[PDB]
Paper text:
[name], an esterase, which detoxifies a variety of sulfonylurea herbicides through de-esterification, provides an attractive approach to remove environmental sulfonylurea herbicides and develop herbicide-tolerant crops. [name] catalyzes the de-esterification of a variety of sulfonylurea herbicides, such as MM, BM, SM, TM, TrM, EM, and CE, to the corresponding herbicidal-inactive parent acid. The structures show that [name] is a dimer with a lid loop in a domain-swapped β-hairpin covering the active site from the opposing monomer. [name] shows a similar catalytic triad consisting of Ser209, His333, and Glu232 at its active site.
To elucidate the catalytic mechanism of [name], we solved the crystal structures of wild-type [name] in complex with CA, mutant S209A in complex with MM, and mutant S209A/H333A in complex with MM, SM, TM, TrM, EM, BM, and CE in the range of 1.29–1.63 Å. The overall fold of these structures is similar to that of the apo form, with rmsd values in the range of 0.1–0.2 Å after the superimposition of all Cα atoms. The [name]-CA complex structure represents the binding of the enzyme to the product. Structural comparison showed that CA and CE are well superimposed at the active site, indicating that the substrate and product bind to [name] using the same set of interactions. A water molecule Wat719 was observed near His333. Wat719 formed hydrogen bonds with His333 and the carboxyl oxygen atom of CA, presumably the deacylating water molecule. However, in [name], the binding of product and substrate at the active site was similar, and no significant product inhibition was observed.
Residue numbers in the entry:
A (entry chain B): 12 to 366
B (entry chain A): 12 to 360
Write the structure that this text describes.
C-alpha cells in the first residue's frame, strides 16, 4: 500500500536563538573565507516536515526520532518499506516529522574556528561522541553481539548497511533547548500526539509538562526515566556490579502532575532479558531501564494518571528490535498505535492542519 | 495548488565507506560512554528522498542543494509556499531530493574524540567554517548590504529568520566522495536530469562526466566554473584588485567533452552588476563568476555542445535572488525549467 494523497506538504524551521561574533561586517571586504567578524549566527533551530491528508481526522501526530537519528526513520524502513509517516497519512492523520536541533536538518552550532567554538565561547563541545556500528547493534538488540541475530528477529536482514548509515553523532546542545524547540512546535500546531523513541522519550515527557497541546504520548523504548524531584527510587546497578542506567531526570512535582492528565504508553520490543545478564551489557541495561520506567509509570498512575507499559510480545508480536516501527512487522506495530489513538478518542472529528 | 498524489514516497541512504577503530568489541564491557575500540563507522553516506507521481511522464529530476543547504530548499519556500518538489511532482516527474554527504541527513563524519578525528587520523577538519547571516545576505543578493533589499527583490520579505535558519556548515569531506555518492545514485535511478545550485553546480558537471545517465543539467547560479585541463582562460581579479573568483576546476578534455553530449542550462537571477563594484564584494564576485561561466559554456559549445546561459531578467523575471526557486515568483521560474525539459524531450517517456 504505497499510494498517498496529500492535501498539502512542506517543511519549515522553528525555534532556536542567535549568537553574535565581535565587531562589524563590511560588505566591501572579502566575504570568503567566512569570518566571525560582525556575524550573526542562527543556532539550535529545528527542522519540521508535515504531510496532511485530504479530510484529516483526529489529532496530528508528531514523530520524534531517537538518539543520533532523523525523521528518515519514520519515512521508510532500511529495506524500503513504508514508514509510519506514510502509514498514518493513509490512516487519515496529519503527520509531522522533526529533525531536532543538532540532528539531520536541524542546526549544528559551529562557526569559524574549532568545532562548536565562537571565539572564546564554547557553544557545543569540540570533542564529540558517537556510537560504533557494534555499539548500535547491541543497543538495538539485533542480537546479543555484533553480527549475530536473535533467531526470532524482526530486523530486515540484508539491509544492515542502509540501517546503520542513518545514525550519527549529536553535538552537546542542552536538552533544555531541544525541549524548547518542540514546545514551540506543539504550541503552533494545536492539540497533538507525541510519538517518541529512545532518547526523545524523556524529552517528550518534559514537553508535555510545558505544553497542554500534548494530548497523548506513545514512547518506543524510552532511554531515560523521569521522576518527581526528590522522589527517585533506588534502582539496582547492572549485573556487572559497576554500571548503572541513565540517571533519571527529576522535575518538580507541580510539572510531574501534568503527566497524569493525558494517556501515556511506553512500548518495548522483544529479547530484553528477565534475569541479570552480565555477559551482554546492553541487554542488561535494557532490563534495568525497563524496570525503572515501570516505577516511573507507577508514580504517574498514583496521581490519577493513565500510563501503561506495552510489551509487544504480550500483544503477540515476537522479535522486535529497538526500532519496532521499521521492523519487518511494522504494519502490526502501527496497528497497535492506531489502537491507542482509538482507545483515547484521539482519531475523532474533522481536523484542519495549521502551524 | 498544494495537493499532490503520490504513487510512492520514501527515502534511503546510498554511498559512503567505512573506517575502523583499534582493537576488539567486547559486548560485556560498558558500551556507554561510546568508544572507538573495536569500532566500525559508516561515513560520508548520502540521504535521498523520492516522491513518485502516478503515471510519471519523462525523466526523474534530482534536485541538489547548494552550499550549506539541504533538500528543504526544494520542499518549501521560507514563507511556506510549495517548493519545486511539489511543483514538479504535480508536473508528473518523479522527484529526488538529496542531502549530500556532510549536510542535513547526510553523514557528518565524527567519532569519539575531537570533531572529525578518528584516533590519530583526521577524517574531516576539526576547525570549521560557516557563513554568518551577514555573509549569506550579500552572497544571496537580497541586497548590497545586510538588512537592505534591492527594490525589485523577489525575496519573501518578512521571513528572513525562516530563510537563514536553513543554512549551516559543511565539514571538509572531499569533493571526490560527494561526486562518488551522486554517481552511485544516478546508477540506481537510471536516466535523469540534475538540477543543481551554487556549490553543487561544479559537482553536477563532474557527475555528468562520470555518469552517462545524466541526460541534462539545469544549474541555478553555479559557484565554481569548470574547464578542460590546460585550457583555463585568464580571468581578471575583482574590483578590489586583490580578490579572485573561485579557482576553476580542471578536468581532462576527454571527460570535459562528455558535457557536449547533453543539454546544459545555467540560470542566473537579478542584480548582478555589469560594472566593477569595489564597494560590494559579493556583487562584484558574482559579476566575474558569471563571466567565467560564460567562457565555460563557450568551451562546451566549441566541442559541439548545447550549453546556454539564461539570465532571468531577459526572460521577463525581475528581482530574483541567488535562490530563484524559493523566491516569490518561483512558479514562473519553475515554468522556465519545464520549458527546458520540454525543449529537450526530457518530459517524454
Ligand atoms: C551517550 O552518553 C549518554 C549518557 C547519558 Cl547519562 N545519557 C545519554 N542519553 C542518551 O539517550 N543517549 S543515546 O541517545 O546514545 C542512547 C543511549 C542508550 C540507549 C539509546 C540511546 C538512543 O540512541 O536514543 N547518553
Ligand atoms: C568557503 O570557501 C570556499 C572556497 C572554495 Cl575554492 N570553494 C568554495 N565552495 C563554495 O561554493 N562555497 S560556498 O558554498 O560557501 C559558496 C560560496 C560562494 C557562493 C555560493 C556558495 C554556496 O553557498 O554554494 N568555498
Amino acid at each position: 500500500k504505497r499510494k498517498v494523497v496529500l492535501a498539502e506538504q512542506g517543511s519549515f524551521y522553528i525555534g532556536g536563538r542567535t549568537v553574535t561574533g565581535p565587531g562589524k561586517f563590511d560588505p566591501s571586504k572579502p566575504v570568503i573565507p567566512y569570518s566571525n567578524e560582525g556575524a550573526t549566527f542562527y543556532i539550535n533551530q529545528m527542522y519540521v516536515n508535515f504531510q496532511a491528508p485530504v479530510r484529516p481526522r483526529g489529532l496530528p501526530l508528531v514523530f520524534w526520532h531517537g538518539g543520533g537519528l532523523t525523521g528518515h526513520i519514520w519515512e521508510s524502513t532500511p529495506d524500503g518499506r513504508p514508514g509510519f509517516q506514510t502509514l498514518f497519512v493513509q490512516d487519515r492523520h496529519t503527520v509531522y516529522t522533526i529533525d531536532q536541533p543538532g540532528r539531520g536538518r536541524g542546526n549544528i552550532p559551529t562557526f569559524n574556528g574549532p568545532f562548536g567554538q565562537l571565539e572564546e565561547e564554547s557553544i557545543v563541545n569540540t570533542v564529540t561522541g558517537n556510537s560504533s556500528k557494534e555499539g548500535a547493534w547491541v543497543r538495538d538488540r539485533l542480537g546479543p553481539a555484533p553480527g549475530q541475530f536473535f533467531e526470532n528477529s524482526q530486523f530486515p536482514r540484508g539491509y544492515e548497511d542502509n540501517y546503520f548509515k542513518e545514525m550519527g553523532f549529536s553535538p552537546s546542545i542542552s536538552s533544555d533547548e531541544i525541549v524548547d524547540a518542540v514546545v514551540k512546535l506543539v504550541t503552533h500546531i494545536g492539540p497533538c500526539v507525541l510519538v517518541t523513541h529512545s532518547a526523545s522519550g524523556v524529552l517528550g515527557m518534559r514537553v508535555a509538562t510545558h505544553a497542554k497541546n500534548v494530548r497523548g504520548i506513545v514512547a518506543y523504548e524510552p532511554a531515560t526515566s523521569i521522576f518527581p524531584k526528590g522522589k527517585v527510587p533506588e534502582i539496582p546497578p547492572l549485573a556487572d556490579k559497576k554500571s548503572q542506567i541513565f540517571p533519571p531526570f527529576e522535575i518538580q512535582e507541580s510539572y510531574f502532575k501534568k503527566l497524569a492528565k493525558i494517556p501515556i504508553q511506553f512500548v518495548f520490543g522483544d529479547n530484553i532479558p528477565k534475569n541479570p545478564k552480565s555477559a551482554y551489557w546492553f541487554l542488561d541495561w535494557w532490563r534495568v531501564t525497563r524496570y525503572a520506567h515501570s516505577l516511573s509509570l507507577e508514580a504517574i498512575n498514583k496521581l490519577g494518571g493513565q500510563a501503561s507499559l506495552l510489551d509487544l510480545p504480550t500483544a503477540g508480536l515476537r522479535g522486535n528490535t529497538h526500532f519496532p516501527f521499521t521492523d519487518r512487522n511494522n504494519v502490526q506495530v502501527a496497528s497497535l498505535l492506531s489502537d491507542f489513538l482509538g482507545k483515547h478518542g484521539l482519531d475523532q472529528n474533522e481536523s484542519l492542519e495549521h502551524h
